[PDB]
Structure formats: C-alpha cells, structure tokens
A paper describes a structure:
Fluc channels, present in all classes of life except higher animals, allow passive transit of F- ions across the membrane down their electrochemical gradient. Bacterial Fluc channels are constructed as small, dual-topology dimers; the two subunits, each of ~120 residues, span the membrane in opposite orientations to form the functional complex. These channels are notable for this unusual architecture as well as for exceptionally high F-/Cl-selectivity. A Fluc homologue from an [name] virulence plasmid, nicknamed ‘[name]’, was used for all experiments.
Residue numbers in the entry:
A (entry chain A): 2 to 125
B (entry chain B): 1 to 125
C (entry chain D), D (entry chain C): 1 to 96
Write the structure that this text describes.
Amino acid sequence: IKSLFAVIIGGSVGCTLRWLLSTKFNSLFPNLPPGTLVVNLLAGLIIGTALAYFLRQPHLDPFWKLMITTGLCGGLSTYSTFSVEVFALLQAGNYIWALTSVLVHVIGSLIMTALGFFIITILF
Amino acid sequence: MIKSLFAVIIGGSVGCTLRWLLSTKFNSLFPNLPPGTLVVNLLAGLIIGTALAYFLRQPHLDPFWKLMITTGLCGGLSTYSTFSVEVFALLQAGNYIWALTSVLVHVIGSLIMTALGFFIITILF
Amino acid sequence: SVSSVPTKLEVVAATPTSLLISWDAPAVTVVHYVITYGETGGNSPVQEFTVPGSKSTATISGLKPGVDYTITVYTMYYSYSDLYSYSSPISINYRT
Amino acid sequence: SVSSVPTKLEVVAATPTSLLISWDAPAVTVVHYVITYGETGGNSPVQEFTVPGSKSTATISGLKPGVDYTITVYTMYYSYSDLYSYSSPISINYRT
Ligand SMILES: CCCCCCCCCCO[C@@H]1O[C@H](CO)[C@@H](O[C@H]2O[C@H](CO)[C@@H](O)[C@H](O)[C@H]2O)[C@H](O)[C@H]1O
Ligand SMILES: CCCCCCCCCCO[C@@H]1O[C@H](CO)[C@@H](O[C@H]2O[C@H](CO)[C@@H](O)[C@H](O)[C@H]2O)[C@H](O)[C@H]1O
Ligand SMILES: CCCCCCCCCCO[C@@H]1O[C@H](CO)[C@@H](O[C@H]2O[C@H](CO)[C@@H](O)[C@H](O)[C@H]2O)[C@H](O)[C@H]1O
Ligand SMILES: [F-]
Ligand SMILES: [F-]
Ligand SMILES: [F-]
Ligand SMILES: [F-]
Ligand code: NA
C-alpha cells in the first residue's frame, strides 16, 4: 500500500506533465510532435541520472526510488502515443517522417539516458 | 480543466499500477528482453489502435472518456524510460545482439499491435 | 488553435463534363480528404469520394454540361487530443 | 526472488604465482564482475579489478608461492526495482 502511493503520486505527476506539454506543443510540428518527443527525452535523462545516482546511494528508501522510476519516469514517458503518431504518418503515406520519428525517439532517448548516467558519474 | 484532470489521473493511476504489478512480477523471468515491460507496451499499442478506429465512428462521444483511455490509461501503462535503461544496460554489458533485438521487437511489435487494434474494429464496422 | 480545414479551394481546369480542383493542405497530419459534389439546385443527390492525404488535387468526372455544381472538401486527420476526427468543410460553386 | 550473486566460484588452474578462476553467471543482466584478492592473513592490502559481463573467468597474477589467498567475486547488475546496484560476494580460500 505504501509502494502503491509512490506509484500513484509519481505517476500522476508524470501523466499530468505529459498532458500539459503535449496539448500545448504537439500541434506546432505535426510531422514529429515535439511535446511527445520532449517528454520521452526528459524521462530518458531522469532515468539515466537515477541509474548513476542510486548506485552510489545503496541505502536510500525504496519508496523514493519507486516514485522516481516507475512513477514519474513511467507516467511522463509514452510508447502508445509514439505508436499512433507513426501509424497515422504511415496511413497518410508520409514514410520519410514515419522513419525519422522512429529513429529520433529511439536514438534520442538512449543518448539522453547516456548523458544522465555519465554526467553524474563524471561529477561523483 | 479540473474534470479533464480527473480523467488523466484516474486513467493514469490505473495504467501505472498495472505496469508496476506486471513488471515486478515478470521482468526477471527473461532478463535479455524483460517480458513485463514488453507486454505493457504491446497491450497499450493494441488499446490505442482500437481507440483510433472506434472514436472515428463515434465522433460526438464525451472527451472525458477519450482522455481517460488514451492520455490516462495507455499513457500510464506504456513506458519509454524503462525501455531505454534496459537497452542501455545491455549496451554497457556488451550484449549487442539483445540490445538490437529489444529495440526492433518493441518498435516493430508496438506498431503491429496498433495496426491490429485499428483494423480489427474497422473490419467489424 | 491549429485549423484542420483546407483553404483556397478552386477549379484550376475544366471540360464540359469534368473539373480539376486544388486546395492548400492544413498544418495537420491529414489521412484522407473527402470531396463532395452535387447540383446546386437541391433536388439532386450529393456524391462523395476520398483522395489520399499526400494529394492536394482531384478530378470530378461524369458531370452534365452547363449546370451549376456545389463542391465541398473536408479532411479526416490525426491530432493529439481528438485522435482521428473529421474537419469542417470548405465550399465553392462552379458552372460547367 | 532471483539471486544476483554468482555461484560455483573455483580455481580451475594454478601455477605457484598465478590462478585461473571461473564461476557460473547469475540469472540477471550483469554489466561487470568485480574480482577482489588478498592474503588471508590480514596485514596485506586487498586489490580489485573488473571483468566484462560476457566473461565468466579471470586470471590473477603476481602472487607469492605457498601463501593462502582469499578470493571474492561480486557483480554490478541491472534489475527492474534497483536499477544498477552491487551484489553480495561469493568467496573462496586457496593456497598457492
Ligand atoms: C514496421 C512495421 C509496421 C507495421 C504497421 C503497418 C502500418 C499499417 C497502416 C496501413 O495504412 C495504409 O496506408 C496506405 C498508405 O501508406 C493507405 O493507402 C492510401 O494512400 C495511398 C497513397 O498514399 C493510395 O495508393 C491508396 O490507394 C490509399 O488507400 C491505406 O489506405 C492505409 O490503410
Ligand atoms: C545507439 C544509440 C546511442 C547509444 C548510447 C551510447 C552507448 C552507451 C554507452 C556504452 O557504455 C560503455 O559500453 C562499453 C561496451 O559495452 C563498456 O566497456 C566495457 O566492455 C568492453 C567490451 O567487453 C571492454 O572492452 C571494456 O574494457 C569495458 O569497460 C563501457 O564500460 C561502457 O561505459
Ligand atoms: C497488421 C497488418 C499490417 C498491414 C496491413 C496493411 C493494410 C492495407 C490495405 C487494407 O485495405 C485498405 O483499406 C482501407 C480502408 O481501411 C482503404 O482505404 C480507403 O479508405 C480510407 C478511409 O477509410 C482512406 O484513408 C483511403 O485513402 C482509402 O483508399 C484502402 O483502399 C484499402 O486498400
Ligand atoms: F505502445
Ligand atoms: F511519433
Ligand atoms: F525515455
Ligand atoms: F528494453
Ligand atoms: Na507512460
């Protein structure tokens, strides 16, 4: 039950952030909706920094780890919205941007996770 | 904005809770391609695809229900961050074949499930 | 805030029994455009057909010579909030 | 429920001044194994070094002949709950 609160509090903050950023920005560039990209890139950055930080602090409460990863990063990022955007582009005959969206989300999200991990490792 | 916020939170909390239970229960069974994280992304792809086809045919339904299913449930259920650390960890461990396989199966798999969701409902209608 | 309705609907070429129309695409992911046409005197059934999202022209055939026609165009498009939905139409009249 | 500690740590080959060790990998994504070694009589500094996750053997060199050594192996690994963390060690004694 205490673990469930961490997932819900963290998850609700993430989903709410994703909802605000997507509705505000996605329509600016429909070929690669920037709200959905930013939330995935940002979640990649946070999980990467968590990767390096939690290693160095093995005695942190599992409540805070759960709230940041499964909660916040889980609620903030999205695979389903990434799919419909690409699916819609494929149905619209826009293959060049369907491919570009897949590469930028995947390559971009791994790069942000690498930066998060190595920035904290270089500091510590 | 407050009624819309409830749809996002109720739907999102159900999705996140489902992802939390399925991942902790199943991910450890096959560490090269964690099956809990795969199933939640494939399942969210299926639901958003069926929503895509269904809501088109019922254009005047409440925006509360659309928001709760897509931004809420499918948004909370699926994950890109966990997909990244799994792949990143495999790359750091020198396990390139499974890092590639994880990327292809999540992407190709999730689009296929969205297509099935859309076309099953379109074929019924 | 972004409009999903097309703009500058017009007839770029005409024969007695056909019209070639064009339009500017709206700044959204259009899956298909729906073209409707019918005789402006309203005792005649309106017909429709789709064209792919990549196209911004269409040919209408099998018309009668010397008759006023009403031609409309709307989109089926993807957006973040509404997923797949239909736009409002844009409309013009043209006499063959 | 899944253990991240290696099993069956053992010396498979030995000279007077070196040891070749092996172990079974745990059922988790291991990023690297950390090998530590030092003289069992505790007035001697313990040394460590890593080996890639793909490997399950290592060579220890520059040892003194006829001396008892304590050798341990632990993992740095990925799991869903804890992300990157260190396992408990598995340990053996061996006399050159
Ligand atoms: C990597 C794995 C991915 C798996 C998922 C595959 C994606 C499935 C979506 C298919 O959607 C189709 O897309 C076509 C365009 O791409 C459309 O053609 C439409 O547009 C074409 C021109 O763009 C015309 O030639 C067609 O007649 C017209 O139906 C067609 O209707 C539509 O159903
Ligand atoms: C494609 C999109 C972008 C991807 C993101 C960038 C790539 C991710 C970072 C990779 O991290 C490095 O991976 C090396 C290889 O796995 C590791 O080397 C380790 O493994 C090597 C191979 O066994 C050994 O030679 C090295 O000594 C040993 O440090 C190294 O520690 C680790 O920091
Ligand atoms: C999991 C498997 C993944 C791969 C599946 C690929 C399937 C693609 C062919 C299916 O058949 C298409 O069905 C569309 C209807 O569903 C038709 O589109 C027509 O109707 C659409 C609207 O319903 C318009 O957007 C199109 O432009 C118009 O051609 C189209 O003619 C027809 O060929
Ligand atoms: F998905
Ligand atoms: F996308
Ligand atoms: F991500
Ligand atoms: F993964
Ligand atoms: Na999510």
